[PDB]
Amino acid sequence: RDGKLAKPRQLHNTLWGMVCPAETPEGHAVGLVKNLALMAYISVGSQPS
């Protein structure tokens, strides 16, 4: 439902340095499947105590 409200296929400005701007499957999955940029890191989480 969330994806319907706003189109996520478009390459958003904020993907810079986080998601590769070029790599995306062609076809029905354009812009929906993404790939991390080389130095992109996803936080594993920690306690805010």
Partner 1 sequence: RKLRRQMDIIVSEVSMIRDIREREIRIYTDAGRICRPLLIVEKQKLLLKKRHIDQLKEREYNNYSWQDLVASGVVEYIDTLEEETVMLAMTPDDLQEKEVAYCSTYTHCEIHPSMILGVCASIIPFPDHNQSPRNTYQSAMGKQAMGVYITNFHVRMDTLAHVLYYPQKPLVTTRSMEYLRFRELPAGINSIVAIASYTGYNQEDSVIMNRSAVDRGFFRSVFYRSYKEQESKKGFDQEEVFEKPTRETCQGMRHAIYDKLDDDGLIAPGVRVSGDDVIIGKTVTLPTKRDCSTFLRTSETGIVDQVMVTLNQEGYKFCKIRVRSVRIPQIGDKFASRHGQKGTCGIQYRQEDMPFTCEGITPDIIINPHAIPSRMTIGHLIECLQGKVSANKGEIGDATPFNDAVNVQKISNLLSDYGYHLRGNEVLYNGFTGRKITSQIFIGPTYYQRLKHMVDDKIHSRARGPIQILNRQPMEG
Partner 2 sequence: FIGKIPIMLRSTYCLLNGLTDRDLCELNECPLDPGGYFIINGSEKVLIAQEKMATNTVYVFAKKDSKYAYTGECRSCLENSSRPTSTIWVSMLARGGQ
Partner 3 sequence: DEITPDLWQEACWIVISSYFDEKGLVRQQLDSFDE
Here's the x/- map for partner 2, 12-41, by CB under 8 A: it reads as: ----------------------x-------
Query: Residue 19 pairs with which residues in a beta bridge?
Result: 36
Phi, psi of 32 (to 5 degrees): -95, -35
45 binds partner 3 (CB under 8 A): yes
Report the residue number, 11 or 34, with the smaller CB distance to partner 2: 34
**Residue in 28, 31, 33, 30 with CA at minimum distance from that of residue 11:** 31
Report the residue number, 22 or 45, with the smaller CB distance to partner 2: 45
36 binds partner 3 (CB under 8 A): yes
Tokens of 20: 């590769």
